[PDB]
Structure 1
């Protein structure tokens, strides 16, 4: 019924994985994440919704000669963390911020075996960086910057045509968070959202526009 997991090259060493899941009210939801190759090693940027899809993602790169050295989840929702439990069972290092794992704990969900704190964190030095722009889609949402390619994975923060699920959003901080993100990564060549198509740096402007709009319509 749902479309199959999809793995497409985005740039040298950078793939987009897209998994699909029926959520009530949204219909069939695409979820983009990334796989990043650092030498012969693969790093998941977000997991698919499910264990099954996460395992297909892993064997796709293991088949091709890459070992999985780590995954990081950009916020606590299952569309970023759905495969952490499966990864933990395979001894694959999982990462999530302290707050993200805190929110997973409080939801009765399996946590990543590694955490980081602070606004900045290198998953792989000079290759894969994690940055927290402030609350928005969720209290814990973080973006992943790839400095050698100028690719920003915005996750569920980047929302150019609607803010999506507001269940855990902070609509009052989101505009300040988006404006900070827009100035910091304005030279990004590609911007990858969770649920919308890859774009250029204008997706940062549009995300700001939608967050300001969303704040005003709540008053």
Structure 2
């Protein structure tokens, strides 16, 4: 009853940052940055908020401003990213996730996205919104979303610059490699939006890569 409200603060041109909040872990109120991303009048969720409620808030806000929600993408299985897939499905707004993410959802008892991509990249919107799979990291399934009609990267929960955070589902042997490949093909990054931090730049790749290796020897 004192969960801070959803925030929808424009980050660039046809590119919003929705910030939502929840507890569980024992970190207290954890904030979750996701992007809304406009294509003409088509809105796109770049993850969901934690809850159905704040998804409907997010949708109505855009719906009410004369954009028509064309799809959801979730960047990994955690509700960080998937929290709103139930709602979207019950409104039969199309939801997207990788085969890996959908398999992890199934395992977790969590309604799956109604669409599956696979492979290294999905062009959710040709030329405009790209999904890229660096490999296992934060989770085994984590993917990121590239904005070519700008130079924005949604790292999601993968980018963890201050320390890797939740490790429960994490693949820490693999992460430093996955990170490396992200920093490589995703140089030329203006903005790099993490899940759980302030928005930065292409260093957050370096910073992540660094945090990644550190755990790799701090637990062997």
Q: Tell whether the structures are fold-level matches, with TM greater than 0.5.
A: yes
SS in 1 for 2:214: helix
Shift of 1:24: 3.2
In 1: Cα distance, 2:80 partner to 2:201 partner: 23
Q: Runs of 5+ in structure 1 lacking a partner?
A: none
SS in 1 for 2:182: helix
In 2: Cα distance, 1:104 partner to 1:213 partner: 29
Q: After the TM superposition, which segments of 4 or more aligned residues of structure 1 sit over 6 Å from their partners?
A: none
Shift of 1:22: 1.2
The structure richer in strand per residue is 1
Superposed CA deviations along residues 21-67 of structure 1, whole A, max 9, x for unmatched, are 01232111010000000001100000000000110000000010000
In 2: Cα distance, 1:218 partner to 1:25 partner: 22
Superposed CA deviations along residues 95-140 of structure 1, whole A, max 9, x for unmatched, are 0001100110111110000000111100000000000001000000
Map of 1:13-52 to 2, 5 A cutoff?
13-52=14-53
Partner of 2:159: 158
In 1: Cα distance, 2:86 partner to 2:79 partner: 11
In 2: Cα distance, 1:22 partner to 1:35 partner: 23
Q: Runs of 5+ in structure 2 lacking a partner?
A: none
In 2: Cα distance, 1:136 partner to 1:7 partner: 28
In 1: Cα distance, 2:40 partner to 2:3 partner: 34
In 2: Cα distance, 1:89 partner to 1:24 partner: 28
Aligned residue pairs: how many?
A: 219
Shift of 1:148: 1.3
TM-score normalised according to structure 2 size: 0.98
Shift of 1:160: 0.5
